[PDB]
Design a protein around this ligand. Sequence first.
Ligand code: ADP
Ligand code: ADP
Ligand code: ALF
Ligand code: ALF
Ligand code: MG
Ligand code: MG
Lengths: 528, 507
Amino acid sequence: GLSKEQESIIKLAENGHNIFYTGSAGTGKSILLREMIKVLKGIYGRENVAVTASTGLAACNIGGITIHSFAGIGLGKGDADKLYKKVRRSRKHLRRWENIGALVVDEISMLDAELLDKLDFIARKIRKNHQPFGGIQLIFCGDFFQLPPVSKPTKFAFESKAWKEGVKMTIMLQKVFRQRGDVKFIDMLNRMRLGNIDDETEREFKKLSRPLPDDEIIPAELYSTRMEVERANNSRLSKLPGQVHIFNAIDGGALEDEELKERLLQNFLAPKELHLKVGAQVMMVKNLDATLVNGSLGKVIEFMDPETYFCYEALTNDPSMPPEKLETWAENPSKLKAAMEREQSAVASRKSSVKEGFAKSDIGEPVSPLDSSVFDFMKRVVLENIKRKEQLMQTIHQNSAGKRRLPLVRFKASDMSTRMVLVEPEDWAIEDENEKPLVSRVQLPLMLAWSLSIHKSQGQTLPKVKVDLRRVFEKGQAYVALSRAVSREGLQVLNFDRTRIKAHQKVIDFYLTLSSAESAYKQLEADE
Amino acid sequence: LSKEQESIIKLAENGHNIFYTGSAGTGKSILLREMIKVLKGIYGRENVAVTASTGLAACNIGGITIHSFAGIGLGKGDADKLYKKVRRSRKHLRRWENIGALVVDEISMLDAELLDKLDFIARKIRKNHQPFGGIQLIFCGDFFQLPPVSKDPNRPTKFAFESKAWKEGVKMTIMLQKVFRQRGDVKFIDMLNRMRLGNIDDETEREFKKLSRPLPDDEIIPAELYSTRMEVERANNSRLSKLPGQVHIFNAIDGGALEDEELKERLLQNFLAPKELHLKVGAQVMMVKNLDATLVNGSLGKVIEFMDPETYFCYEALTNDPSMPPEKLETWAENPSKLKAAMEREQSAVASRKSSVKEGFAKPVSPLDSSVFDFMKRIKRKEQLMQTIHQNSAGKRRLPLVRFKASDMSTRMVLVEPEDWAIEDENEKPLVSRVQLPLMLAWSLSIHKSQGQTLPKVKVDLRRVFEKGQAYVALSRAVSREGLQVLNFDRTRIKAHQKVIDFYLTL
DNA sequence: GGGTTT
DNA sequence: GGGTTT
Ligand SMILES: Nc1ncnc2c1ncn2[C@@H]1O[C@H](COP(=O)(O)OP(=O)(O)O)[C@@H](O)[C@H]1O
Ligand SMILES: Nc1ncnc2c1ncn2[C@@H]1O[C@H](COP(=O)(O)OP(=O)(O)O)[C@@H](O)[C@H]1O
Ligand code: ALF
Ligand code: ALF
Ligand SMILES: [Mg+2]
Ligand SMILES: [Mg+2]
């Protein structure tokens, strides 16, 4: 049930227009975009639509990747000319820029003008085409009353020449869906969007400091800073039943400033001390393949070594398999190894030696048995309780005594598909001019993700959420946090301060220039 | 003056290892200045280490940063790494051997792990298993003021009093009570004192909020306090526009052994020294590098004029003998070679390497400001001769000439030259680097650097307060409410650390 | 303070 | 967010 307004935005995109569309939090911008992408792929070809957002989690929300990863620009810091040369040195990224017909960019408010101009420069040069983005069709989506770009001065995306020359058409949504049960809640949010909080709104938000329902549902929690988020995630993890599994990163290398090293290690995004349990909610923080990327969300199923996981995966791919195969692998692990390995640079092999000494195996420490929940896939004819496989699997797991046990994670994509991944340690490095590492880390590419920074929460729908505004420092940050909620009953707000909720005048000015959904219908009848 | 202040001095004189404390403005640093004199007469002038946690707080008592005194650099490595670094330096090794007393002011911004490392270094160097190798300790400060700064995501800071070194070394604690700085306003003192403990009632909040009114439009340039360097720099550059002079621009010169420009740009972000430094006659500045015994990080001064070294040598000669024979200035004016010969009569490879980078630090004529010719105005052919000598400097760097003032009120006239900063690998290879003047504008201060100052006229903007004790430090700099303006006061952002509350209950 | 990376 | 160095 897309609205008339939402569908008209899809049809304008179908007709080939360069559009920016927008609307308050939870007006269905990303939900419509999911549908739009399906039809753009049929117009341009499945691989010829770049699906992108300003953050990894917001990109995963629509089945896409970071604009940075897609473009091939890294952090995109330098001169446009250097970035273009960096991109064309990557055959994957050069072909992508030559081949795509459409570029979808969600949560665009966090992309600064300098980035937009450089992306435009890169597309024009690669495609040998002086049209606004080398002629790529533009679908820009977001709300500039939400978070602005991180400025580490930055200008908004709509201030760039690339924007003003590329964006042909704008459409504004008005109906709020996320909080549709509660019209008074919507008005509180919409005035907060514009920075205009009155006494009754302040009273109503301050009422929400009461704790959330005590149900067994683990709440989402939103904070301004990573230190708050990490503290809240590790707090929740300690409350989870179960033995903790600790993954201590291996850090190097040669940079002398100890503090600078730690600051740089932070932006590898995986923590120095990763603590995990069965059932922990985790986020992938490295771009590993097409569908396992920075922002992919998952749940820890158990901890297994690769040998145990091979048998488990074989069992989950054929539950009615005769247990004879599993018994051979139990009593003859050399055949498990051969069976497993039948299916599977130089400084690369020197990173594998470092990864070999990661999460070191304790030959003395007893291997806890597999949580019984992992055999539920079988346990949905009296002979057909030949689930002797379960004890066979438990034996094979005990034979992992003195081997490293990695988290098995079920990742869930935005289209609801799932993927089982035994998550291996990864490596991050910053190197000098002779390729010696200045700063390096080996760690699982995971972090706890019940709690989110408000930045990474932007784009999420959170039906049970606690928000602590104590450390908000950006315009729109408080609004993003509170507008994640679905119902007032599923929202707790701590440290609400109306003086720290103020909108950017440039955005107020810009939004008076935008066209309505009714003008969108007029364009469509003009189109056809 | 007070009996309480004198008795702290008497205890130190008697040899005790002392921590002493009290609310902001109780005279801890004023009494420290007299105590330092007494200790120097006991141990020897060079044998009392006078230090503090920040450069500006150190200058307030005629000292230097504890890091600079210790020889440990940034002081983040483990104890054995730092010990080797210190003893590898002969000046710092002799200091650690020779001093009989170590004075540390504003001790609340020093982490416990640093005190443990200094303890280790002192015991090893002096071959002595007593606390800090038998050095007498005088620690001073207020832990309800700012805590130690750490950018470590993984390890939280520990207050100095949590360290084994403190618990074993600090034998004696004294608490001062009478607040002197806000003497004539007893209600302001109560407002500040409960604010120190995180207690602010409705009436006190309304009182602070009333101080949003502007400060009087007298001739006096107010000091201005902000939480962040960005705010500080914006305020300093605003006030720089308020001065009538012509602007003088100093652009930094960057380099390093790195070739990947996106990493070099990622790393240059960290540097204190600006890409661009703007100065005028009369600008208030602060030295940010330790250059010699009395020109250090924290030295405050005022820009007099901008001169090349040839001109300054002439100006310096004139200020050192205003009843000069004018024939010398005419000779120098009409024969700059003789100027240089006289200049150089008074006077490596990697050092000549940067010294050639430094020669490229400037490049079109501009007459001097009439202020620099004060002479003895308490017949004057010397003035326009100096102007002539100046105009010949077309085509060379005209550096800021700065009048620095120490806390003892002694002044010092310095022509300030560029300096270097580098980020290095473990073999001291420079990865990225910057050449720039060791100066920043200093009308506005961060609240961190203000800790320890007394500011009779101050504007405070608390908008970006993020740290326990920060609002309290800012507002307690003021002498009177009449001299204080407060913007963006937030009572929720002022609560004390429970470990500090607990620590002081025991004293 | 906060995203972004073969 | 802030501070500390040749
Ligand atoms: N047309 C619609 N009908 C019913 N529910 C909708 C509709 N559009 C959006 N929603 C729901 O509202 C919520 C917010 O949608 P989303 O696309 O994330 O908002 P936005 O991207 O505008 O912030 C989602 O839970 C979505 O399922
Ligand atoms: N005994 C005293 N008599 C008069 N004024 C004093 C006395 N002690 C301190 N002061 C004044 O109070 C102000 C704060 O002193 P200071 O030592 O800077 O305080 P603290 O170090 O405790 O913050 C200074 O201006 C100082 O001149
Ligand atoms: F605008 Al949204 F989730 F994308 F609130
Ligand atoms: F405690 Al102070 F200036 F040293 F307020
Ligand atoms: Mg969205
Ligand atoms: Mg003091």
